[model samples]
Target: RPTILLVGASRGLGHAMAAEFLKRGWDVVGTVRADRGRTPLHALAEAYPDRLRIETLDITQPEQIRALAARLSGRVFDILFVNAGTTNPDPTQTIGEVSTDDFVDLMITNALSPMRVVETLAGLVPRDGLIGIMSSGQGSIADNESGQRELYRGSKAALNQFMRSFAARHAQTPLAMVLIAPGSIDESVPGVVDVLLAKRGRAGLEYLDYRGRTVRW
Candidate 1:
């Protein structure tokens, strides 16, 4: 069985991804925010006791990332899923009305956190391993029709650049780096978006779905 390391697996898309990997019989080491309650991740771990292990992690902090990396230094994984992200959407605030604090928080959580994880865990990924970043189509500069979400858009745009640049830098490596922009997901209740996001990632990153035709990135 191939081992997999998931950076964020407590809730939302992260949790869903963990479950998907578990179903496929992959050995999973999932990370949850240390400050956040771990009951949910623990329960999931219980379900796949042989295949899943949950660890306390806070990706925003460099020390926590380094510590985790050191703990797993001898281990290797086929896939490293960087699936944690934060979106603070101010529906009422336009581009000019957005707060500076919100902007910085979004950038740190959405863009920098994933990069930090990749940097820390890059050594753990085998030569043929794959790295995936959960980005959004809103980040695409070529596809910006609605211009209301300034902070979210800006953060995702920065994430896309990070993905592109990182891929370029690692071009010689056997690993594949991919950025996935999951389309608008309706969050009617808990775990809905998570399920959808997991399915999308499993389908393949480059495939974009519209009404009937596939949209090109």
Candidate 2:
């Protein structure tokens, strides 16, 4: 079976992605923030004993990525999907009104953390192996006429930009990179599952909408 390194799979979309990925015949190594807290990921480990192995990680901590990468040094996966994300407490606040601390925390958690995972662990995945993150529709500057959720929107936008850069950095090389823009797990889960199941890798990178369509930058 193909393997998937699914970051932040403790609950919500990440949790459901793990369950669905397994249903689609991929084994997943999921990560939770702490070892003490028994999460749905662990429940999956119990139920899908042969397919799920839970790992503890705090994405905001860089050392943890290095440590985890070291632990799985020789491994490669068919997919490396970073599913963790965070937002400021007030969705209505404009970027100017958001507190500096919240901005920093949100950026680090929502943007930096995911990239660190991809940069560190992507080496473990290759052809037919897709590297992606759970970005949001809010990341689209062209579609942000709503002007709401500024902090969250900006974070995903930063992530989108980073993915663009990541693609550019490796364009001359070969890697299949995709950014799965958010809708919800139940609605788009199987679509993502099938997208990864594709036999051929796209030449460069793409920022995708929830249904697996590319969004206009």
Candidate 3:
């Protein structure tokens, strides 16, 4: 079976992605920050048994990512999809009023940490494989007409730029890279799976939505 390494799959959209992928006959290794009893992921694992395994990963923590890389050393995955994201406590607050601690927390979780996971684990995916991150449409500088979620938007924009740099640096490698803006969180999970499947074997970077439309940079 084809395999996917799904980061941040303990609950919500991430866990839904894991379930959708497993339903499509893919072996899934999903990651959670910690085992805080039976998460939905744990139930999903029971349902899929041999096809699903859960790993511990807090993307904000570099050591955990390295440790995960070491533990999964010889394995190869067809896709490494990071579906991690977070927002500040107050979404309506403008960037100017954001606290230093909140800014740091949101950026690290939404921007820096996801890329760190990719940088460490990307080699596990072969040249023909795909690497994808969950980006927000609000990340699109060209599309930000309303500008509601200020810090959330900035963090995702940072993630988009980081992914762009990653793709540029790996220009010679035939690794398919994508940043997806799922139009609606839970509603788009299955479509997101379809998008990831459709993108494999295609090289370079694309910023797309679950519907597979290109999102502005």
Candidate 4:
């Protein structure tokens, strides 16, 4: 059985994805912040006691990452899902109100955290394994016509570019690197919540309606 390493599996999409993989009988190692406790992840672990392992993971802390890498040092995974993200609603900050700290924090959480995970787990993902980063279509410079969200949009845009460049640099390797833009998710955004709800009670990465054509790199 192939093993999977999912970086964030506390709630929402990450939790759903973890459930899907567990249902398929995959060996899953999921990460959650230490302070968050076992409430969110316990049900999944209980359901698949033999296959699921949940651990503490705070991406911003290098020590925690190093410790995790050390603990799972010799283990390898068939797939790695870097699906952690942070969204800041800068309703007051059209552009001028956006603080430098907010911008930097968003970039670190949205872009750099994934990179750090990849770095630490590089040895675990096999040569033929898959590495997927959960991105958004809002990141697309070509798709952004309404420019209301300066910080969020800019952070995702940067993430897209970084993923593209990273993929290019590793093109010779057998590993498949992919950046998936999960289109307008209907929650706070216009098309995001409805699309997300469409997959309600389901599991894994489901494509919602109103998602534009897949963007190829």
Candidate 5:
């Protein structure tokens, strides 16, 4: 069975993705941050005792990613998906109104930290393996006519840009990279999995939606 290392799978879409992967018979090594008591992922782990392995990680911490890379030194996975992200408390707030601290925190959590996880643990994925990140439709620069969730949108856009840079730097590799704009949680997981599986050996990066449709960059 192919294995996937799914980061930020303790709750929300991440947890749902874990369950979906388990249901599809893929062995999942999912990560959850420490000190959150028992999460729904723990229950999922119980449900799929043989296929689900939970690891402790807070993606905001670089040391944790290094530690995780060390722990899985020689391991290999068919896919490495990073599903962690956060937004400022008030989506309605203008970027000018958002506090500096909040802006920094959101950017770090949503953009910088996820890239750190991907770059650090990329060695675990083979040349033909896939790398997927949970980007949002709001990340699209061309589609931004309404202009709400400014900070959140910018963070995701930053992620999208970074992933493009990642693809450019590794242009010769056979790895498939994708940034998925998941419209809705439960509605999107299955299609997201299908997209990832289909893109297994294809090279370069794609910005796509859950239904395997290409999303505006």
Candidate 6:
């Protein structure tokens, strides 16, 4: 049976973002399949019990995503962001010589799996709801002059291409889409929340930086 589950982690830095999102008055949820005793979110949860929940969805495994979706069938997520776990093991390894298996994992986890999550769960979002994926500036082919993090860069680039194609597929839909390349926090700028609120009803895809500015394709 589908049910709301709890997930947590704030290593201290994590909680700040949650607090920021809390300010914007949007319903928020995080997930953990297991109870991880102490958490930054626990403090926040103490303050507002009903407004948040820890939802379980193991992004890498398809069946896990499916099960989570089943229990959340009629629920709505105004912002659907798929966050990817990236790699830079050697940091020095160029795409030409990176481990083939490592490359395969990136393609599967970072590139392909995000789209699958969107495909399965996007229906839960309203038309004006924004759909997003965490991307990186390194994904920009135009920005590859430095030639580092090749494997990470390539996978993100693939994610971008996939997002672009996904946007086109839903071009006529009223949903707004964004690819976010997070930058260092400027405590002064709640850029992400602003973009989410600012782009409502603005249907289409965009690649944006932490400052809420558009990034190159």
Per-candidate Cα lDDT values, in order, are: 0.71, 0.83, 0.92, 0.69, 0.92, 0.70
Q: What tens-digit string does per-residue lDDT give for candidate 2 at 92-135?
A: 99888888898999999888889999898887787546887888
Model 1 segments more than 4 A misplaced: 89-92, 184-217
* RMSD (Cα, Å) of model 6: 3.9
For 1-217, candidate 6 gives per-residue lDDT tens digits of 1111212223232354455666666556765434366566767877868666665555778898788788888887777766655576686787778777888988888888878877777877788778877678888888778878888888889999999999999888888988877664545237755665676668999998767888887
lDDT of 5 at 68: 98
Question: Over all chains combined, what TM-score does candidate 4 have?
Answer: 0.82
Which one is best on TM-score? 5
Candidate 3 Cα errors over 4 Å, as ranges? 184-186
User: How many residue pairs collide in each prediction?
Assistant: 0, 0, 0, 6, 0, 5
Judged by whole-model lDDT over C-alpha atoms, candidate 1 comes out at 0.71
lDDT for each residue of candidate 4 in 58-89, tens digit (9 for 90 to 100): 99887788888899988988777777787886
Which residue pairs in candidate 6 have backbone atoms (N, alpha carbon, C) closer than 3 angstroms, thus clashing? 2-71, 5-54, 6-32, 7-31, 7-32
Off by over 4 Å in 2: none
Please give the lDDT score for candidate 6. Answer: 0.70
On the 0 to 100 scale, the lDDT of residue 44 in model 4 is 80
Screening candidate 4 with a backbone cut-off below 3 angstroms (N, C-alpha, C), the clashing residue pairs are: 184-192, 185-192, 185-193, 186-192, 186-193, 187-193
Model 3 superposed RMSD (Cα): 1.1
| Model 1 Cα shift for residue 119 (angstroms) | 1.2
Residue 140 error for model 6, in Å? Answer: 1.0
- Compare candidates 1 and 5 on TM-score and give the better one: 5
Candidate 3 least-lDDT 10 residues: 182-191
**CA lDDT, candidate 6, residue 186:** 47
